[PDB]
Ligand binder design. Sequence first.
Ligand SMILES: OC[C@H](CC1CC1)Nc1ncnc2[nH]ccc12
Ligand SMILES: [Cl-]
Length: 167
Amino acid sequence: VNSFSGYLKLTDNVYIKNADIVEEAKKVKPTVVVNAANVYLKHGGGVAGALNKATNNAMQVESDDYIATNGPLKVGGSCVLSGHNLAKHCLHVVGPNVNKGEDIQLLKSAYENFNQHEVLLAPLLSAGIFGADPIHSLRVCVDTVRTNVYLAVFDKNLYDKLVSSFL
Ligand SMILES: OC[C@H](CC1CC1)Nc1ncnc2[nH]ccc12
Ligand SMILES: [Cl-]
């Protein structure tokens, strides 16, 4: 039993809700919140900009030190950093950005990072400003993630389409 509330159950392990991931994280304080990161951990917009803003830029400060030490992530890769005031940990995961021409096949590799964590609050990877089809992202999530994932989402209209079209 966990403290996630109001989610629709899609499969044994995947749950979904129309919600603002910032507000969800602040309420639940999950062990792991997933950020929709880029390889430079530059948290400008979308989920990343919103999460970073909620940390008063502490996420960006920590991220800049991470990059200075380790260099950029790989598309499809991830790193674990602090969750600041939002969660114990933040798993920064880089899905392919279609608006940069990146290979959508890398979306499965991106979701594989979730399997290293028993429970996660997460957005749909590569959706929103990353330019992928969210119906596809949800399908890849369900077919790749085996741990317990709580998908937040932001767009109410999009949520209804994802539910009604789910196979
Ligand atoms: O595919 C991720 C999704 C995509 C379209 C809704 C823009 N973005 C978000 N999902 C959940 N919470 C969020 N908070 C801020 C942004 C955000
Ligand atoms: Cl977005």
